[PDB]
Amino acid sequence: VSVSEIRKAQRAEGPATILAIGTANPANCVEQSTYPDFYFKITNSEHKTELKEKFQRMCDKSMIKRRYMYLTEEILKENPNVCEYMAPSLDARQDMVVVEVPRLGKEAAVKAIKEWGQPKSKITHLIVCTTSGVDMPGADYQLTKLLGLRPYVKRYMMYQQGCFAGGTVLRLAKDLAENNKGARVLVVCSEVTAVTFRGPSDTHLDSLVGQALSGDGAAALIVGSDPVPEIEKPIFEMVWTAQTIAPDSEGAIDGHLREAGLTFHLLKDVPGIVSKNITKALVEAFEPLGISDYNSIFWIAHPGGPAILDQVEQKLALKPEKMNATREVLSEYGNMSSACVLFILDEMRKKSTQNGLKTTGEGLEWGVLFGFGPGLTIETVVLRSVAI
Amino acid sequence: VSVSEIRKAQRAEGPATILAIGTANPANCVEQSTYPDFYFKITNSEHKTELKEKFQRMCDKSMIKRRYMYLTEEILKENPNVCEYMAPSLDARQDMVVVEVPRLGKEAAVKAIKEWGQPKSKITHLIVCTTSGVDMPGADYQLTKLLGLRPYVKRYMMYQQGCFAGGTVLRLAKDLAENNKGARVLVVCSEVTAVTFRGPSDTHLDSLVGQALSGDGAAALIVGSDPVPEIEKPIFEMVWTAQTIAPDSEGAIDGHLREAGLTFHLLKDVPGIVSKNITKALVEAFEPLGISDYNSIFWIAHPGGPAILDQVEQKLALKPEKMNATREVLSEYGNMSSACVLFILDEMRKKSTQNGLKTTGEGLEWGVLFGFGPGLTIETVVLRSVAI
C-alpha cells in the first residue's frame, strides 16, 4: 500500500469556504432601556442605590438596544441561588444549559442546512462550541442525535473557550475542510448566559459589566473546500489564520467555573490591550498580501463591548462605516460570545446582497475577522469575499 | 493575489507523523493489592462489609498492579467532602486539577521536546486534552506559559471528552500537521482522578468500578508532516481516522460535572457494545487497504477495563500477544483516560526497539489504535510503523 497515493486521494484542493450561515436566539427579548430596573428587582438589590446608578450608566453606554435571554422572570423566580451574587447554583445552571445549548444550536443548524440545500448525510464533520456548561456525552453528541446526522460524523467539542472562539471554530474548520476531500463541516456556536447570570455586588464591578453586555444566541455554518459550482453557493473563503496572546495581558479576562456558576474577572484594560495589539495582528495577516490600508478591507470584530470597537477605530483611523455590521449585531443582540462574529458575517453578507453590492464583503475583496477573549487571546481569520 | 498559489504554498505534503513521545505521572504510587483497605478506610466506609467485599473482587479482577495518584492520604484528610459519595466539592477539586493538569502535562511535554531535539520555538500548534476540570484561560494557556512556547502557538483546548479522546487528539493533530507546511504540533493529554474520586455507595456500583480502575498520568507527542531526514525521527505515521457512535448504546457511559464533582454512570454493557461493534470499525479502516487478518496488524486499544480487552480478543480470535502492550500499561498505570493509548504507543515502540524488532509496530507494517468513551463513541486511527 502506498501512503503517498492515499494522502493524495484523501485531501481537498481549494480554500475552505463558508457555504451557508444560519442563526437562532431564545424567544425572550429583553429591552436594554428597562434592564437596570428589571435586573435590580429580580436580584433583590433595589436598596443598592449607588450600585444601581453605576449599572444604569453601564447599560446606557453599552450601545445594546436588546438581547435575547433563555432566562426569564419565571425561571429566575424559581432559582434564587442564581439571582444571588454568589450562591451554590451550578447544578441548576447546568440543568438549564445542557438542554438549551443543543436546543438553540439545532435551530441555527437547521437554518444553515436548509440554505446549503444538500442532504444532511453529506455532513462529515461537526464542530460544536459553547462556554455554557459541560456534559458527557457533550453537546456535539446531543446535536448529532437531534439533527439525525450520520453516527460516524467526526466531532470536535469545544468547551469553555470564551468570547474568542468564533475565530477558533473557523481556524479549526479550515483545516478539516481543506485536508479532507469532500468534507463538509457543520459548525455550531451556541451561547447561553444562564451560566454567568448573577446578582450585583459593589466590590465586583467587572462581574456587573458582563450583566450589561452578554446575551444569548447560536449561529451555524457549513464549511467545505471545492464547492460544486451552481449547486453550492460560496459566501466567504478562508485564506489564513492566527491565534496569539497579547503581551502584558495576564489576567485581563479570567473565568472560573465553580459551585456558584461561571464568574468573570476583568483585571486589566481590555479595550486598551486589544487596541495596542491590533496593528501587529493586521500586519502579520496582511503584509504578506501586500495590503496596508485597513479601510480597504471588510471588517468583523468581536464586540466584547463598545469601547473595544471605539478604541480600535480610533487607533487605526477606520472610517465609521467599517464597524457597521459589527455594531448592528451588538445593538440588536448584545455580546453573544463565540457566536457573535458569525452573526456579524451573516449581517454583512445579507446587507451586501440586499443592497446590490459587488461582493459579500461590502463590495471589497479582502477582509478580516477577529475574536478576543481570555489569555488575552486574539484570533485572526483572513477572508476573501465572493462576487455577488 | 492568488488564493490557489497561497493554498499550494501553505500546505504540507506527507502523512502526519509522530516524532516524539514522553510520559509523566504523579509521584504517589498506589498498590492495587492493598487498595480496598485504603479506600474504605479513607472514605469512612469500613462498616459496609458486603460493599467492601464487592470492591475487593473488582480490584482483584482489574488486572491493574498499581496506579499513580495526585490524591494522597494527607490531601484526602483535608477534604472530607471529596471522600463522601456525594458532597459539595467541585471548588476543592477544581483548585487541585487546574494546577495539577498543566503541572503534570509540562513534565510529559518537556520529555517529548527533549526527544524531538528541535527548538520549542518551532512548535506551531498545541493540543491539550483533559477531562479533569475546566478553567479560563485553559490548560493550553497554562502550558504555553509554563513551557515558554511562542505566544502565537495555535491552541486547541479539548475539555471534558473522556476516555476516548486519545484517539480524538490524534485525529485532530493529523489534519493540523498535514494541511500546514512546517507545522509541528505538541499534543498533551493530562488526566487526574481528583475530579472523580468519591466514597462508595451500594446502590451505585457503576461509580465504584471507576474507583478500581482510574489512575493519573500525562503523555505528550510531537506530530508533524515532512520530517527532516536524520534530524527528526519518525515513530509512527497516521494514515486514516474515524469516529463513530455505536448503535444501541445510549447512556452506556455518561459523566456529569456537578457541585459534587464529576460522576460517571454506566447504564449498559460496555465490553459487549465495544466487542459487537469492533469488527465494523476494523472493516471500515482496513477493507480499503486490502487487509482482513486482524492478527497481521499491531494493536493499541483503550483499556477502559480488562473485559473490553478480553471480549475483543475473543470476538476476533486475536492471539494473546496482540494486547500485550495495552495490558502492560493497564497493569502498571490503570486506566488513565485520554493519555492511556499514548502510553501504549510509547510502550509498543520502546519494547519493539529494545528487543531488536524490524519496525516500531512489533515488526508489523500496519496497526490500529482505538479509543472508547461516552456516546458510546469509538475512535479509530490507522497507523503505519517505521523501520527500526
From Swiss-Prot, chains A, B:
Signal sequence segment:
none
What domain of life is recorded for the organism? Eukaryota
Picking any one GO biological process from the record gives: polyketide biosynthetic process
UniProt pathway: Secondary metabolite biosynthesis; flavonoid biosynthesis
- Coiled coil start-end: none
The record's GO molecular-function terms, alphabetically, read:
naringenin-chalcone synthase activity
Q: Indicate whether Heme appears among the record's keywords.
A: no
Q: Relate the outcome reported for changing C163 to A/D/S.
A: Loss of activity
Q: Which InterPro entries match?
A: Chalcone/stilbene_synt_C (IPR012328), Chalcone/stilbene_synt_N (IPR001099), Chalcone/stilbene_synthase_AS (IPR018088), Polyketide_synthase_type-III (IPR011141), Thiolase-like (IPR016039)
Q: Which reaction does it catalyse?
A: (E)-4-coumaroyl-CoA + 3 malonyl-CoA + 3 H(+) = 2',4,4',6'-tetrahydroxychalcone + 3 CO2 + 4 CoA
Active-site positions on this chain: C163 (acyl-thioester intermediate)
Annotated keywords:
Acyltransferase, Flavonoid biosynthesis, Transferase
Similarity-based family: Belongs to the thiolase-like superfamily. Chalcone/stilbene synthases family.
Subunit and partners: Homodimer.
Give the protein name, as stated in the record. Answer: Chalcone synthase 2
Q: Source species, please?
A: Medicago sativa
As recorded in Swiss-Prot or TrEMBL, the protein's gene is named CHS2
